[PDB]
């Protein structure tokens, strides 16, 4: 009763005013070494998911 906001979720995703789940890009923090500047930049972005994106919004809501 009274579902718990999946904590491991919110700690890595934010939901936007519109309602689309923005997520942090993966693949930068370890694989690195000399990844072309063009690499570690295009990775510094955030972005959108899709169908799992809708699974996400299911895990929060009180938030």
């Amino acid at each position: 009763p009274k579902m718990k906001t999946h904590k491991g979720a919110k700690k890595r995703v934010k939901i936007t005013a519109s309602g689309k789940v923005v997520a942090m890009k993966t693949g930068k923090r370890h694989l690195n070494w000399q990844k072309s500047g063009k690499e570690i930049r295009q990775k510094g972005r955030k972005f959108v998911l899709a169908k799992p994106e809708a699974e996400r919004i299911k895990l929060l809501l009180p938030y």
Binding site: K11, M24, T26
Partner: protein
């Protein structure tokens, strides 16, 4: 008007869907018929596959929390002056929450766009935008103090 015929105004019919019958939702009863259909399965909400949800997306929301937690800090409340210019007079935080925009955020921050009023709007924080439009209207006092 009497008690015969109030009747849920033709559109709310509690018609549940009991699926134990001979025709309709039947036998397997509801969308079943396969297997792994007992007391339910693992999610599907977030979890599953058995691989890795998509918990591959990584934490960035650092400053997520020490062990004490949340710090005693003011919490300025944004509220568009266009939403203020409705009623008139000498508007203050008090007169503001006394309406329906605030809910005790103490700090208020009149700002935004539209048409300010030639009134006095006491507040806890303005915007360089609201400030000037408002100077082109009436007066405006800063915050009290702490």
């Amino acid at each position: 008007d009497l008690r015969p015929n109030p009747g849920a105004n033709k559109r709310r019919k509690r018609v549940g869907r009991g699926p134990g019958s001979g025709h309709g939702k039947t036998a397997t009863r509801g969308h079943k018929g396969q297997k792994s259909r007992s007391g339910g399965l693992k999610d599907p909400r977030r979890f599953e596959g058995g691989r890795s949800t998509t918990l591959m997306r990584l934490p960035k929301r650092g400053m997520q929390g020490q062990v004490p937690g949340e710090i005693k800090r003011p919490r300025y409340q944004g509220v568009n002056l266009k939403d203020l210019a409705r009623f008139e007079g000498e508007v203050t935080p008090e007169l503001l929450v006394r309406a329906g925009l605030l809910k005790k955020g103490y700090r208020l921050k009149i700002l935004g766009e539209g048409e300010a009023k030639p009134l006095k709007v006491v507040a806890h924080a303005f915007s360089k935008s609201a400030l000037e439009k408002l100077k082109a209207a009436g007066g405006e006092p800063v915050l009290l103090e702490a």
